[PDB]
Symmetry: C3
Subunit: 227 residues, 3 copies
């Protein structure tokens, strides 16, 4: 089985540790043994002027996953939305209103559905690839979240000159390490079976970074970067 999955992302934080905007969306291709990505694509947002309210995030994920799936032709796309295991193709207002999710969730999806559902139908019609809202039980979605963290740290090493100082909130329970030109990212949860990832990075001279727990977000780490 060969799976494409997408996720956003790390976050730029305040001094207060409050998030101001998300950084990276990543789409990944995952095959046996399902511990890492075979292939990756990335799209960076503007974490300043990002609306944390609403889901520009899921819109970008679907879009990016479709793009990579056209290239790599997986059997299926996994979407990070825990809706059962349902096909995005079939998410019209009626089937949404029959879902076992909160009323607030239903409203959010009806707005999303207006364009995402025709998009998934068209994509399916010409590729036969389903987009399944499986969410939390998907290992590829988790791998994509690790990569979103990895490329958020990359976006931080790279953008720390423009900005003077960067506080980046990493996705849940993951660590990032930089040695000799590459960034390696890992789940901190051994229960997930050794999920990891990698990317190349060019470290400007004299930039330092530390990784440590976010005191106000337990189980999340901070990646802090100085110039």
């Amino acid at each position: 089985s060969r799976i494409v999955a997408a996720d956003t992302g790390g976050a730029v934080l305040d001094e207060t540790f409050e998030p101001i905007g998300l950084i990276a969306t990543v789409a990944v291709l995952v095959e046996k043994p399902y511990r890492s990505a075979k292939e990756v694509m990335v799209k960076y947002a503007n974490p300043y002027d990002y609306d944390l309210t609403g889901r520009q995030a899921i819109r970008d994920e679907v879009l990016l996953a479709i793009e990579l799936a056209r290239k790599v032709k997986p059997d299926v796309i996994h979407l990070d939305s825990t809706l059962g295991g349902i096909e995005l193709r079939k998410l019209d207002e009626p089937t949404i209103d029959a879902l076992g999710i909160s009323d607030k969730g239903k409203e959010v999806w009806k707005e999303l559905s207006k364009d995402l559902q025709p998009l998934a139908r068209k994509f399916w019609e010409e590729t036969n690839i389903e987009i399944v809202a499986i969410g939390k039980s998907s290992v590829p979605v988790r791998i994509a979240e690790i990569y979103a963290g990895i490329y958020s740290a990359k976006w931080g090493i790279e953008n720390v000159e423009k900005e003077g100082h960067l506080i980046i909130g990493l996705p849940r329970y993951m660590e990032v390490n930089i040695k000799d030109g590459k960034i390696i990212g890992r789940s901190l949860d051994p229960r997930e079976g050794g999920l990891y990832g990698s990317a190349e990075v060019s470290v400007p001279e004299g930039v330092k970074w530390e990784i440590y727990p976010n005191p106000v977000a337990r189980r999340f780490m901070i990646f802090e970067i100085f110039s």
Copy 2:
């Protein structure tokens, strides 16, 4: 304190990673320091022709635990069913109907109790050993579930000739390793405090096995076997 507990089991999966049937039921005797089994007994089911619907599994566990408990005479049996520590002896329809579980749960139990309650009562009358429905908080229940994974793996090594290829779904967050005739099973969650188990196995010539994350069940591993 000396405790007996039982649990089923590992699963045979198809190519879609959907379970077709459970494999091993194991009862274990656990004593200080409560990290492993002092003694074990095993009953294999037929994973093909197995009804995943319903609960032949809990019926087999009670039956196996009772068998082992007559032999080793523990102080108590832990049953993998989270009701609030209640003795199976006293689970008649009226007490069930006042339990704090879902209505669907109450119906399963009423059916189950029809024969399991006289059984637990009879067994207690002659042994004074209770069967407590404690479930999730029980370490010996978790240790039993690791052994069920270990013996599902053993079942896999030894049944991999008849069947040409075998995909086994392990119980949550546990790994299996085979060295030199023994399968070692271990929890992957360090929070549980180093739970582990062991069994002997004779690995047929030229069979290979891999272990990797179940892509569609996060935090569950696959034990894959070839002939």
Copy 3:
């Protein structure tokens, strides 16, 4: 950012593993990189003649945190109560009756707030330090809980002559190790990012200790001490 937090505690258990009373209340000063305490203060309860019913524990916590905060002057105090991060200062009956917690939770807090709310208000008026009911998401609160575990162990090494035998239930998923006059305590959960802490201990001649899983409370350890 510099944070004070408090928590109770470890527990003395009978032979059934049922708790009879809480042992240590600890306040800690936590700063970057938020993995440990910069400074600690402790207050032991009498675990015999302790009322597990109600919350003398949260009262002693606020009291102890305030005491340490007067000394080290952090920006904020984290309180171990998951109320949404509301300031203890403002917890009167009306705002409590509008919180999204259970009705049982509202009543406990109404009783608590009768003295805790004037207390927080007085303290704020002369210090400008808030006490925030942030709870579960707070790393400093989890670090205080590791320290309460560590000092419960200390309390056990030093009270094991008076009482012949001591069984101590450590806080959730944490281990304790003693080498050369030092107790080191660690979270067992790697997802937390390496939280740890330390205390000095004088181990009386010929006392023994063991750490192992509590069979009836999964993910909680026992610290068992002999004289």
